[PDB]
Amino acid sequence: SHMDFVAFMNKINSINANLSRYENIINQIDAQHKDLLTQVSEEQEMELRRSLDDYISQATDLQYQLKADIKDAQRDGLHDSNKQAQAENCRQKFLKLIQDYRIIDSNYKEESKEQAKRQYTIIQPEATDEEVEAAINDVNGQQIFSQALLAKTALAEVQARHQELLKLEKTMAELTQLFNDMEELVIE
Amino acid sequence: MSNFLAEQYERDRKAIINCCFSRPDHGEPPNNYITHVRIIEDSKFPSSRPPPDSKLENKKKRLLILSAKPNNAKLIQIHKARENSDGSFQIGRTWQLTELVRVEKDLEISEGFILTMSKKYYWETNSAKERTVFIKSLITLYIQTFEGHVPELVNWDLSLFYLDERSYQRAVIT
Amino acid sequence: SNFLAEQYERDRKAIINCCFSRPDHEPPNNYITHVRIIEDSKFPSSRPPPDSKLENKKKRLLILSAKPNNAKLIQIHKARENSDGSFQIGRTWQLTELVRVEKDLEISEGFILTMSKKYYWETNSAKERTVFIKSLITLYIQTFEGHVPELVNWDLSLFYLDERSYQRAVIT
């Protein structure tokens, strides 16, 4: 009906609202990445991690809602040429933003591995270069019982960056599975 | 009818899977079929655009197949096969997806494209929209596999791969 | 120091009297050990900043017990001391849920337990953390056929382990 159409527009307006909301979150995540890669004091370093941890969870929530809200608009358009394209246009915009996020965490990951290799050649003066490459790469690594040195507090910052690398790759694994979820044309 | 291609796609899909991606070898288990496409290759012009008057003797009917190793979904292989008279398929050349460096569209021929591994390979599909489907399948499979990177894209509409100008220039290997 | 042994002794008999004495329909669980912890209200899953206001700290206790019909069903409890002067259990895990036990290298009192979620607490001192973790892991070894949780930043000599014996006894 006619009233059954303005509800579909409310769905499209709600999706576009959470799409620009999701784009500003991704761009905010990238800003934290650029700042965390420079020499910043421990004072506001964890204040940037706190904002980053809050942004990453906000992204996870908006991804799940957009995944459901768009797929909800797709099945409404199963029997209308225009309602299908509008929901399809929201799906293509969603996938574009997932691709931006995936690339953003990709650049920050390689620039965090290189930033961790510079933090690892000091605690392990040997190994370089063949063995420092496989130390940062592949969980778990050499963090186990490298505790011969009980300056003493900075010995755990390499583990903070190494776990962040794991948290980044898991996120990209989530973004990859979300990217393939939206590529499925769900029917009902 | 514009829908016969989908009929021969599923037909070729079962044929490809039956003989090349279902039985063990000599012996790792077979790779996992992903997608395929029928390509045309010029025997005396394999790495560049053939001249417009190249007689049908130089043309070859081949197929490109994308598969992944059964114990690692991040090791995708690019295969090249031909139809046997028996009806099945025979893989002739296998590339590793990590070898993909450049993907170029032919601005003049709506079916031609260039893939660049260790060498340059010019191929063209049967229809203009089969080039778009397969290349979008290949690029998507690359971004998904290699941590969100892209090979050098030339003459392509970046929106087809859910990219724009500043995100391509940020994930391109160059 | 002296009072510390008397502090956990008054807590022990009070916890038993309030939560592990009379049956409430099944008989209660048998008390094993406990430790006084500090829980951050807004940062319960990671290290809080030093400038975290004291209005975010909470005085809780981690209690270990087991059902009287099976000494291999150890449960983890999070008790609360209240204004009434009484103990009240408000969170319960199964010992099988324990996956990762991590020690904070910078904070001598901080430790991380990873059940369904991650939980960061602080003991009242560095020695009380060692006692509770050494009791928790030993209880885990004795229960799950010699297996250990994923131990991080722990000197395995405390649990009579080394590098080779840990990779074979871990659950992953």
Numbering used by the authors:
A (entry chain A): 33 to 182, 190 to 227
B (entry chain B): 74 to 99, 102 to 249
C (entry chain C): 75 to 99, 103 to 249
Please share excerpts from the published article on this structure.
The exocyst is an evolutionarily conserved octameric protein complex that mediates the tethering of post-Golgi secretory vesicles to the plasma membrane. Most syntaxin proteins contain an N-terminal region that autonomously folds into a three-helix bundle (the ‘Habc domain') that interacts intramolecularly with their SNARE motif to generate a ‘closed' conformation, which, in many cases, blocks its assembly into the SNARE complex345678910. The rate-limiting step is the interaction between Sso and Sec9, which is hindered by the auto-inhibition of Sso. Here we report that the exocyst subunit Sec3 directly interacts with Sso1/2, and promotes the initial assembly of the Sso-Sec9 t-SNARE complex and stimulates membrane fusion.
We have obtained the crystal structure of the Sec3–Sso2 complex under two different crystallization conditions, both of which demonstrate that the binding of Sec3 leads to conformational changes on Sso that is crucial for the relief of its auto-inhibition. The interface between Sec3N and Sso2 is ∼700 Å2, which is mediated primarily by 13 hydrogen bonds and 10 salt bridges. The seven main interface residues on Sec3 consist of K149, Q219, E222, H224, Y237, R241 and R245, which together describe a horseshoe-like shape on a relatively flat surface of the Sec3 PH domain. These residues provide a platform to make extensive contacts with Hc of Sso2, and some contacts with the SNARE motif of Sso2. Additionally, side chains of residues R241 and R245 of Sec3 form a finger-like structure that cradles around Hc and reach to the Ha motif of Sso2. In the Sso2-Sec3 crystal structure, the N terminus of the H3 domain bends approximately 22° away from its original position, and is tilted towards the Ha domain. The crystal structure suggests that Sec3 interaction causes the bending of the SNARE motif, which then led to the disruption of the hydrophobic interactions in the core of Sso2 involving HL2. The four Sec3/Sso2 dimers in the two crystal forms are essentially identical. Both the bending of the SNARE motif N-terminus and the relaxation of HL2 of Sso2 described above are found in all four copies of the Sec3/Sso2 complex present in the two different crystal forms.
